[PDB]
Every structure is written in C-alpha cells, then in structure tokens.
Amino acid sequence: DIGQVIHPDDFDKAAADDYVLHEDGEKIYFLIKSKTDEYCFTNLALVHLDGESASKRVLYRYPYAHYPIRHVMFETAGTVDLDVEIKFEIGGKHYSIDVDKKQLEHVKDLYKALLAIAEKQYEGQKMLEFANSSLNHSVTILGGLRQGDMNVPQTFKDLSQESFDWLQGHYYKWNQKDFGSFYEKYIN
Amino acid sequence: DIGQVIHPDDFDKAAADDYVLHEDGEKIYFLIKSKTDEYCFTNLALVHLDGESKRVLYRYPYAHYPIRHVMFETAGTVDLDVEIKFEIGGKHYSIDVDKKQLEHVKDLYKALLAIAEKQYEGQKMLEFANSSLNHSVTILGGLRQMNVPQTFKDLSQESFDWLQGHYYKWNQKDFGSFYEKYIN
Amino acid sequence: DIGQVIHPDDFDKAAADDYVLHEDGEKIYFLIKSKTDEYCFTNLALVHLDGSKRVLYRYPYAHYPIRHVMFETAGTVDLDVEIKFEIGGKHYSIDVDKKQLEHVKDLYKALLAIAEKQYEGQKMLEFANSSLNHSVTILGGLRGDMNVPQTFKDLSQESFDWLQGHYYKWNQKDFGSFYEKYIN
Amino acid sequence: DIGQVIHPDDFDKAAADDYVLHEDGEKIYFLIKSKTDEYCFTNLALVHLDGSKRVLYRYPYAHYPIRHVMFETAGTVDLDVEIKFEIGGKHYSIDVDKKQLEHVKDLYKALLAIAEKQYEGQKMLEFANSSLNHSVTILGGLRGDMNVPQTFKDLSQESFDWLQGHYYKWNQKDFGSFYEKYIN
C-alpha cells in the first residue's frame, strides 16, 4: 500500500510515537505512514506497526544492534507510476516500502542513510572477527609460562579480566546501538 | 478472558498479593485481573493465578525464566481489547486487556521489552566470562616455583569467585527499576 | 484425604512427634493431619506417616531435594486447597481445609524458598568442582625446593577441605530459618 | 543502448548525482548516460541506474573488485565502442558513441589500473596473514619476567592493529587518483 513521508512537526501526532522509547532518548528521524502500515526509523531501531487487514496493528521493533540492515535497494517511478519503492532486509526480514513519488527527494535521503548503516555494520562484523582472532593469537603466544616474581592467583584474576574486557569492549564497539548521526548526516 | 489493569491502591485487595513475597521485599508493579486469570508483574517474577473457579499458582522468577519475544497488538475500531504477548521460560503468554487502558499496557510492553533485552545481553556476557576463565587457565597451565597448597586453595577460590560472581551479575534477579522507569 | 493444619501447641500430641529426632534438635515447623496421613515438616526433613497401619517415611532435605512446588486454590464448590511438590523424585499432593488457606500459603512460600536454595546450591557445587580442576591444570607439573612428602600431605588436605567444605555448604541440612521466615 | 559520455559541468544535471554521497566527499569522475541506463563512476563506487523505473545499484570498489577489463573499438559500420568489466562478479558491457572514443579509452586505462591495484592488494593480504602466523609460530611458548595481563592486552592490540591496518591498506576504498591520472 502507498505511503507518505511525514514531516517532523507531525511525528508526535503519529501512532508510532507512543512506542518510541523517549525515556531512553530514542528519537524519530523518518516516518512513512500508509493506510495499513507505519514505518518509524529512529536512532536505535525500526518500529513498524503492521496492519495485516484492509484496523488492528501488530507492533514490531528491530533494534539495529540485534537486527542488521542489508541489501538496501531503491527503485524510481516511471511516467505512469505513482510510487518509488525502497527495499532492505533487517535481521533477515524483507522490507519493501512504496512511497508517494512526490516525496522522492526524501526517500532518496533514507536510501542513503540505510546504505551507510548497512556498511558500518558490515565493517564492524569484520573488526569483531579480527578482535577474536587477535585474542587467540595472544593465548597461543603466551601459553606455557614460568612463575618468576608472580602472584599466581592475582595474575589469574587480572588475566581473566583483561580477556573479559577485550571480548566485551569489542562486542559493544562493533555492534553499535546508535545510528542517529547517520540519519542526521543525510536527512538534513 | 478480557482483563483490567488494576490501580496500585487496589493491589493489596488482589488475590495475587497473598502470594507475593513481601518478606523478601517483593513489590507489585503491574497487575491485570480478568474473570479467569490474574497476572502479577513484580520486581522478581511473574506470579500467575491461572483458571481453566480453582486457581493454579505459577511463579516465574526472571532470573530462572527469561523473557523473550515481547509483542504487542492494538485494537481496531470493532475490537474491545489490546493483546500483549511474550514468552517466559518457554511458556507462551497472550494477555487480552481493556482497550480503554492502552496507555498502561503500552508501558508494560516497553518494560518487558527492556527486561528481555537486558537478559539477552547478560547471556552473551556470561559466554565472555566463561571463555575468559578458560583463556587464563590455558595461559597459566604448566608453571614453575611457591607455597603449593596455599596457592592451590587461593587459585580454586579465584575461579569460584569469578564463576559465581558472573553468574549472579548476568542472571540478575531484580528488575524493579525497569518497571519504575516505564510505569512511574 | 482433606487435612487440617495443626497448631504448634498440639504438635507434641501428634503421632509424628514420636519420630522427630528431638535428640538432634529437630523441630516441627508445620504439620498437616488427615484421617489417613500425617505430613510433618521439620528443619531437617519431611516426616510422613502414610496410611490402620502407618508406613513411616523420612526424607531429609539434604538427600531429597524439593522441586516443582505448586499451589492450587479452592473453587466456590471445593472444600480444600492443594499444595504439591516433589521430594527426591516422589510426588506429593496434600489436600488441606480451605479455611486454613492463610497457613498453607505460608508453607508454599517456604517450600518455594527451600527448593530455590537447593537448586542454586547445585550450581555452586558445579563451580566448586570446576574450580578445583582449574587449579589442578594450572598447578600441573612444576619444579623448586620443597619437602615433597609434607607438601603431598598438605596438598591432599586442601583438596579434601575444598571438596568437603563445599559439599556441606551447598547440600545444607537445616532449613529452619526458611520456615521461621514465612510461618512467622 | 548507445550511451553518451557526459561533460563534468553537466554532472549536477544527471539523475545519478542525487545518489552520489556528496556528504562523504564522493565525487563523479565519469558518467555515461544512455536512454535506458546511467553509469556513474566515482572515487568510491560504480553507481548504476538501471532501466520508466530505474533500479539503483551501488558497488563500492572496496567490496566489489573490478576484474577482466576489456575494450572493443568500432568497425566502419558500427556506431559504438564497448567497454567491459566485471564488478564483484557482475558482468558489465557499456556501449558508447564512437565519437567519444578518446574519453572511453581513458576510462579503460583507469579501470585497468584499478583492477590491477586490487589484485596486487589481495596478494599483499595473503603475505600479511602468512606473516602474522609466522610470528605466532616463532613466539609460541616462551618463559622470563613479565606482566602477564598487560602483555596479553598489548599483544592482542598488536595483532588487531596488524590485521586491521592491512585490511584497510589492501582493500583501499578510494580510487580517485586513478581517475584523476587518466582522465586529466
């Protein structure tokens, strides 16, 4: 069904705004409203109110951090067509959204934003891999040591921590939660 | 059966309050009462009085029964109820609530969604904690010389403290603040 | 058969009191008497007189864990409430006069707390054992000046103290404070 | 469909310019427009508008290597020259007005240079990885006074910097200097 890009002034009037986690500073950067669906793109997630009837709505929430964006596509309108179509996959779920060709200028900005998000996520997955591999190379290099001047239990504690910090630091660095700056950059 | 979000002032009047562990500081943050069921969300657990007039009492502490797949469904023009769904442990819960009180059920949705996420992230951290302990065991395998029996005691203790401490940190028991953040 | 929660002052008048180990400071915290059975919950065990012969059973908590603690209320037409649990692997369902619900709900809370402590203890045992092994691995083949035979003795004592100490800590025998907390 | 090499001053008038990431300093170095398609070669990617709908494709060089760059001149009777290449695995053949041969030959040279740099980089990656391993092997099991946990951290950073650094060096993103060298 064909959708309308909503202006920022009318975000608070949208059904989707009730499900935005304003409490956690979640902010709406792009909203497309159709007769049957509402697609809300925030700094943290895609909030989607799915109408599977020609009036009840199923609420979905896909935080980017747990549901990566991939295969971002765009399709323009011909002379005879009334809509432009934007596509992507979030987690593994396929999204195809038809939008009033009048608002192409705006949908093209979303296309750019999503494309940039997908890439940052992709690159992050590559860095996680190196992060883990580096952890192993240390384990292998440092295997089989001597006591010398060593407090064994303290050293055992501290070593467990270093490993933890590295696995953790990298997990949160390369699975970033917030992509507001990406919408900020292209939605201007 | 269609339920009513109960007001805080009427929590001590509810059948579920008798099964809340007031002795351990358990506090009710959300209660939905229907003609057949009673669903009590405390800081520590879901307490469910289930009718199929007898009531079967279930208790699902969050620490041992993780919340997953938190869903919400709104009311159409013709419908009288909004539905909140989730899985606690493996059990599927679907609770119909008076559409009039949507403002409150949406807050529960947000709370549950936040708990589920915290628990998910904690599971991943446990994996890191365990994997890290192995990496030290490997790096420190086969040594030199040291007071062997004192070292043996102390080293066993570190391992224990590490395993235990992480177990309790990432399987947190209390989620009161999550309800407090979205309800109040 | 529908039972009656007995009052503390009438404990010494029950058939079950003859089988409580007063000599070891065993104290009755809850007794349900029916026309056929007698269920006696002490700090150390469930003593059950099963029936006009009676077969005596004793299930010390330390050797028979309590699990799957449930509760079931009465309907308008029912005269009883039912408390259920498994002790060791044995299934118990005990019908009690709905008039005494306030008391049976307390037993429910206590047994629930007992069961959880036992479960958590079984996890701690696992960490305790796993830690022992991690020191064995780290301390594997060493070197260094040392009184080998004394160190061998002392080392064997440490391992014994660890294994033993944790065995007694996480298979605790006495749960009197649990009953005390919820029956009080 | 026979295309036209567009002049730099008319780049901002092409449909493709709307999809260039000016915000990240992406600059168009070569644009061929046909009645159905639009091929836009930037420092970072091939942007292709495929056709009155147009499907937008973007193939950043860093994720889609250019290979098998070919060229085909016009015969007396032909109106076009054809430039071919594979990007990722996708086959591209682009017919262009034989009048503009002088320009398409420059694109040919640039794409040829891009493709070679990418190939050579894939060999360097292989050496970079193989070298990492040779240090792991040489540095396998050591001894010596040492702050084990700091050394473990620092060591893990080095490996990360090596893996990362080489990843970015040999999968370079920007090939603007290549176009600049042959279109100038």
Numbering used by the authors:
A (entry chain A): 14 to 67, 70 to 203
B (entry chain C): 14 to 65, 70 to 162, 165 to 203
C (entry chain B), D (entry chain B): 14 to 64, 70 to 161, 163 to 203
From the publication, what sentences describe this entry?
PHb2 contains the PHb domain at its N-terminus (residue 14–136) and a helical-hairpin structure (∼ 68 residues) at the C-terminus that extends out and returns as two α-helices (α1, α2) to the PHb domain. A short helix at the C-terminus (α3) docks between α1 and the β2–β3 (L23) loop and, as a result, links the other end of the hairpin to the PHb domain. This hairpin attachment is crucial for formation of the PHb2 homododecamer. PHb2 is also a dome-shaped assembly, but with C12 cyclic symmetry that is generated by crystallographic C4 axis and a non-crystallographic C3 axis. The PHb2 assembly is significantly larger with an outer diameter of 150 Å, that is, twice that of PHb1(sl). The PHb2 dodecamer buries a total surface area of 46,700 Å2 or ∼ 50% of total surface area (3890 Å2 per monomer). The hairpin constitutes the primary mediator of the central core of the dodecameric PHb2 ring, mainly through hydrophobic interactions. The packing of hairpins involves the docking of surface hydrophobic residues of α1 (around Ile156) and α2 (Val167, Phe171, and Phe179) into a hydrophobic pocket formed by the adjacent hairpin of the neighboring protomer. However, only two main-chain hydrogen bonds [compared to five in PHb1(sl)] are formed between the two strands due to the separation at the N-terminus of β4 and C-terminus of β5 to accommodate the packing of the α1–α2 hairpins. On the other hand, the six independent protomers in the asu of PHb2 have similar packing environment and are essentially identical with each other in structure with an average rmsd of 0.27 Å for 180 aligned Cα atoms.
